[PDB]
Every structure is written in structure tokens, then in C-alpha cells.
Enzyme design. Structure first.
Site, short mmCIF file in Angstrom:
data_model
loop_
_atom_site.label_atom_id
_atom_site.label_comp_id
_atom_site.label_asym_id
_atom_site.label_seq_id
_atom_site.Cartn_x
_atom_site.Cartn_y
_atom_site.Cartn_z
N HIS A 161 29.76 -16.62 -25.36
CA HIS A 161 29.95 -16.03 -24.06
C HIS A 161 28.74 -16.31 -23.01
O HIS A 161 28.90 -15.81 -22.03
CB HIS A 161 29.94 -14.41 -24.42
CG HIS A 161 28.93 -13.52 -24.79
ND1 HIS A 161 28.52 -13.30 -26.17
CD2 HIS A 161 27.97 -13.14 -24.02
CE1 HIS A 161 27.54 -12.68 -26.23
NE2 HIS A 161 26.78 -12.61 -24.77
N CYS A 201 21.46 -11.31 -26.87
CA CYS A 201 22.41 -12.23 -27.53
C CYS A 201 21.83 -13.55 -27.88
O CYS A 201 21.11 -14.16 -27.01
CB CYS A 201 23.62 -12.27 -26.69
SG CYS A 201 24.30 -10.72 -26.09
N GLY A 226 20.63 -9.16 -22.91
CA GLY A 226 19.76 -10.16 -22.98
C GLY A 226 19.46 -10.64 -24.31
O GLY A 226 18.81 -11.90 -24.57
O1 LIG Z 1 27.11 -6.29 -25.66
C1 LIG Z 1 26.51 -7.54 -25.23
C2 LIG Z 1 27.55 -8.02 -23.94
C3 LIG Z 1 29.05 -8.64 -24.51
C4 LIG Z 1 29.97 -7.58 -23.92
C5 LIG Z 1 31.21 -7.53 -24.69
C6 LIG Z 1 31.33 -8.66 -25.81
C7 LIG Z 1 30.36 -9.68 -26.00
CL1 LIG Z 1 30.47 -10.97 -26.90
C8 LIG Z 1 29.04 -9.55 -25.32
C9 LIG Z 1 25.27 -7.28 -24.50
N1 LIG Z 1 24.41 -6.64 -25.76
C10 LIG Z 1 24.28 -7.18 -26.93
N2 LIG Z 1 23.24 -6.44 -27.68
C11 LIG Z 1 23.15 -5.39 -26.54
N3 LIG Z 1 23.65 -5.46 -25.34
#
Ligand SMILES: O[C@@H](Cc1cccc(Cl)c1)Cn1cncn1
Ligand SMILES: O[C@@H](Cc1cccc(Cl)c1)Cn1cncn1
Lengths: 304, 304
Positions: B41, B145, B143
Site C-alpha cells: 500500500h 506500516c 506511519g
Molecule cells: O491502517 C493503516 C492504513 C491503512 C488503511 C487501510 C488498509 C491498509 Cl492496508 C492500510 C495505518 N495504520 C497502521 N497502524 C496504525 N495505523
């Protein structure tokens, strides 16, 4: 979101760990620049530990008796000296992995990460608080002496603790990096009283703020209190008295959530007087005091 | 003595963290040998995340669009490919800090350490379990990820998790290092059901053994039970059914303490049916399930 008992990344500290052997005893040492720091009891045998005369025991030791090994590498010891309860072994090679560092004496109620080591090898890392009575409730077995506690501010490691001893009560005692014990402890195999401990009030309030930020809000109520009234409850429940300096340090969390510090104190008063009623806060069924207000802000903003 | 929620030393993993930027999005990448792994992503914008067509979004990207920086050092990207939900960016330089490593797919109920990172910089390390429903209850902000989960066996890092997403419920989801999600999750900004979760029974029993080893024994009783009887209670309290394979894995702890596994099950049955009565076990007021039997033995013997 989510809130965990997080330790600092230990990489910068792992690079400093060495094994120190003197006679029959092996423990951990911290190699910073051309000096290796370790607990002075590395010079004792089991018979010595009842009441060691450290000055006399060290006089029987020469530089060549201190065997320092950094995994593979053997360090050449060119000087030795005792400072309080630590030994400083000057070596001929500066550690290439020495990070930017400071030696600090932390205050009771402050938190730090511990890198548990055995034979100079890191085994695990955990976060803990220095109790108000200067003990720490760690996880240390025989051989863990010389493991250190630390904090990191960007690229600077502030070493605050070196592990020396387990009290007969199972709690832990150690020194700052100048070899001064935190608390009344001496490095002798003797039963030693730890003071009456208290719960770190400012940290529990910081943790209730972390709970509100992360969605746990059930404990918030329609009440407020005063420092005086709250301190009567803190007294009854063996919590540290709250001061204006603690209220001041909670300012950022109070501003971020919009919950006045004294209103959070009224939530804490009700939890002390009523318990949790079989519910949890941030996965805990008790009031957590091992997160300072700084730890909460750092974790809630993603500081690296 | 003492028992803590201990993470593996993170040094070997810190050396692999990089920042990956594609367009407007920045997240973390794992640099092992000449390949950088990161969540796919990184190629999305906010409008793309409702239902991204990853194959089409990646076709608009060239090697030069993936900016990889390891602190100071800029990596030259010479290839890119998508495998499941991860991108593999081939770089022209093998990471000099690549430890011995494996990619493993962990089972639900197993534990691992997470090195939370932001912009390629490590911020903290904590231990957690993969829930039976394939989520993890971590501490991750936007951030984070690309932050990874791992275990270490002497000098080998087994990477088991890469963080991708926070569910609307505040729990976390991610993939193995081949980009396969644990659980039913997809990398879309969509409300997604996590299965019914259960408590990891074998881990709670392992933790009761750690409690007995470390002096907390108040919960031991004069009773025993059977797998069938215990499993009726486990059913009522949303605990995983106990099998002979779990009893087998508890063998070393049972042998060390002299407490038969089914006798520990009777202590667990009584705690489930009666609660803790305002008491604690290893500083917890609830039944802890984030320590496997292996974690308990490792910690109780001082493995490096
Ligand atoms: O949820 C993450 C963003 C996003 C949204 C939806 C799908 C995906 Cl694969 C990524 C951000 N995030 C990760 N931990 C805390 N916040
Ligand atoms: O207590 C330590 C040995 C000892 C005894 C008495 C005094 C001193 Cl300074 C050292 C061993 N140990 C440390 N953590 C767990 N075990």
C-alpha cells in the site's frame, strides 16, 4: 492506536555488552570508549559475599586477571580502578560501537529499559520503573549482574542503571554508572530492608490519559476533586502524594484530551475507592504505574 | 527471579530498517541482502485505499519512483515486484548489516517481538502474541506500516510479521514476509470482521508455571481435573480447548515444578470460576496468555 509497555530499541546497548571474568566469577560489563564498567563483586568468590572487603580483594587482582571478551574479541586490560560499587577496566581499544552516551542518575518513579544479559550476551529487553523505594521489579537470574538500564533521546543513550543484586524478597537492586546504589543497599549477601514502596501517582494518571486517548473511557466520571482531597485518598491507598509539579508535567496530556488534571484525579479516586468492577483499562485489571507522562506522549506521537 | 513481558534484543532488526517513499506515502521497509520488503500500500494515495487496484497502481510506478533511504544512505532500486500484499524492491547494494534470517509463518497463539518504526527509524520494542483470530493488539500509529515482528534463535532472526493495518476496532493486522495476511484481512480501508477471539490456554498454564517458579503459589489447590472436564470450563470461558499436544509442550515446566499439567488445569479452572479475589499473579490482576511454554523456559533459564 494501542498502548504497550514498550522498551527502547536495544541495538545501541547490545553493541556495548561484554563478558568480564575474574577468577571463578563471570558477569556482564559495559564497554564505552576504552573503559569497561562492571559490578565490583566480579572480584568475589561465594565465601567473600557475606561481607566482602572489596579494597583488599581488589589488591590481589592485576590487570591480567580481568578477562574481558566481546563475543569473539579479547580486550587487553591496561588499568583497573574501583569507583563506589563498580570497577572501571581501562582497555587498549576504544569500542567501535560506542554510541553517543551520558551517565545519568534517574529519579524514583522514572522509567527505563533493561537489556538483560548473560555471559556478555543480550537475552531480552523490557521496560520498568525505578520504584519510589529505589528497587526495580525486573527479571534477573544469576549471571545477569552488569546488565544495564537506559533511556534514549534521538541518538544519545543515557545509562542510568547497572544491575547488582537480587534481594531475598525477589526484588532487584543496583547502581548508577558511577557505582552508587539506588536506595540503601550494599553489595553484601545480607538481608536488607527496602523502604515501604508507594504507587507512582503521576504515572497512573499519565496511563489513564493514554487509556482515554486509545478509546478506554469507561472510568471517566461526572466528578472533580482537589489536590488536598485527592491526597487524603492517595494516603489511604499508599499512592505518592500529588504535587503541582506532577500536575504541570501532565499539562500536555490534559491539553490534548481536554480533561483537567483534577478531573482525572476524581476518576482515579473513584477507581481507588471502588476497584475496576471486573473491567480492564488498556488490557490491565490493575492501575498501571510504569508509564511516565513523557512515555505516554512519546508513544502516542510516534517519536523515533 | 522475576518474570517480565520480555522482547528479543532488537539490534539485528534495527540494522535492517529503511524508509520507503512512493509518491506522497512513506512507510517502513526491511532491507535483507539486496531486497527491500514493504507493504504494497506504499503505492496508494488516500483516494486509492477504499478499494485499490494494486496491479494497476503498480504499473504506473517505475524503479526510480521508489525512494529507499537507510538513514543517510540512499539505495538505488534496480527492480520491483509485488508478491501477495508486499513489494520487493531489488536494490544494487546488499545490506552489510543483514543478520542470519529466515521468513516464517507463525501459528496463532505464538509470540514475537515487534520493532515499531516510523520513517525507517526504530521507536520501541515490545512482545506480543498472534491472537487465535490472527490479529495482534499492538501499538501502531499511522506511519508504522512495514514495522516487523520476529523471533531470534541464537544468531538467526525469524521474521514472522509485517504490519499493514489497523482495523476500525483498534486491533492490528498484517502479513508474513511473503505478503500473505494472517487472518481474513485484505489491505483495503473497509470495515472487516476479525473472528471471535479466544484466550490461549496453553500460554496461561505456562504463565501459571512461571508464577510458581518465581514464588507466586497462592492459586495452587488440592484439586485435579481431566482434559474433558477442563475443556467444559474452557468452553464456558472462551479459552482454547486444551489438547494432548499442549500438555506435551508443558512437560518440561511440569517436570521442573513437579506439578502435573492436569493439577495446574484444576488451579486454572478454579481461577476461571472464582476470579483472583483481588489478588495478583506476577504483577497481573488477570490471566496472562502472551507467554508460550518456550518463552517461560527461555526466561527462567537465561537463554542468550
Ligand atoms: O491502517 C493503516 C492504513 C491503512 C488503511 C487501510 C488498509 C491498509 Cl492496508 C492500510 C495505518 N495504520 C497502521 N497502524 C496504525 N495505523
Ligand atoms: O544477587 C546476585 C548475587 C549477589 C549476592 C549478594 C550481593 C551482590 Cl552485590 C550480588 C545474583 N543475582 C542478581 N540478579 C539475580 N541474581
Amino acid at each position: 492506536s494501542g498502548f504497550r509497555k514498550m522498551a527502547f530499541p536495544s541495538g545501541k546497548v547490545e553493541g556495548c555488552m561484554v563478558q568480564v571474568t575474574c577468577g571463578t566469577t563471570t558477569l556482564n560489563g559495559l564497554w564505552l570508549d576504552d573503559v569497561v564498567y562492571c559490578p565490583r563483586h566480579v572480584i568475589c568468590t561465594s565465601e567473600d559475599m557475606l561481607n566482602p572487603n572489596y579494597e583488599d580483594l581488589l589488591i590481589r587482582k592485576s590487570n591480567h586477571n580481568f578477562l574481558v571478551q566481546a563475543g569473539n574479541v579479547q580486550l587487553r586490560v591496561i588499568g583497573h580502578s574501583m569507583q563506589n560499587c563498580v570497577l572501571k577496566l581501562k582497555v587498549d581499544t576504544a569500542n567501535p560501537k560506542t554510541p553517543k552516551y551520558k551517565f545519568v542518575r534517574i529519579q524514583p518513579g522514572q522509567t527505563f529499559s533493561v537489556l538483560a544479559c548473560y555471559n556478555g550476551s543480550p537475552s531480552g529487553v523490557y521496560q520498568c520503573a525505578m520504584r519510589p523505594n529505589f528497587t526495580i521489579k525486573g527479571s534477573f537470574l544469576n549471571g545477569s549482574c552488569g546488565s544495564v538500564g537506559f533511556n534514549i533521546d534521538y541518538d544519545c543513550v543515557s545509562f542510568c542503571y547497572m544491575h547488582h543484586m537480587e534481594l531475598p524478597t525477589g526484588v532487584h537492586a543496583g547502581t548508577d554508572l558511577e557505582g552508587n546504589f539506588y536506595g540503601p543497599f550494599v553489595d553484601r549477601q545480607t538481608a536488607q530492608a527496602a523502604g515501604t514502596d508507594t504507587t507512582i501517582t503521576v504515572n497512573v494518571l499519565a496511563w489513564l490519559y493514554a487509556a482515554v486517548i486509545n478509546g478506554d473511557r469507561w472510568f471517566l466520571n461526572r466528578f472533580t476533586t482537589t489536590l488536598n482531597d485527592f491526597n487524603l485518598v492517595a494516603m489511604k491507598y499508599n499512592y505518592e502524594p500529588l504535587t503541582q509539579d506532577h500536575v504541570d508535567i501532565l499539562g500536555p496530556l490534559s491539553a490534548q484530551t481536554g480533561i483537567a488534571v483534577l478531573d482525572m484525579c476524581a476518576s482515579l479516586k473513584e477507581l481507588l475507592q471502588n476497584g475496576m468492577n471486573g473491567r480492564t483499562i488498556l488490557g490491565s485489571a490493575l492501575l498501571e504505574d510504569e508509564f511516565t507522562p513523557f512515555d505516554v506522549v512519546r508513544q502516542c506521537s510516534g517519536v523515533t
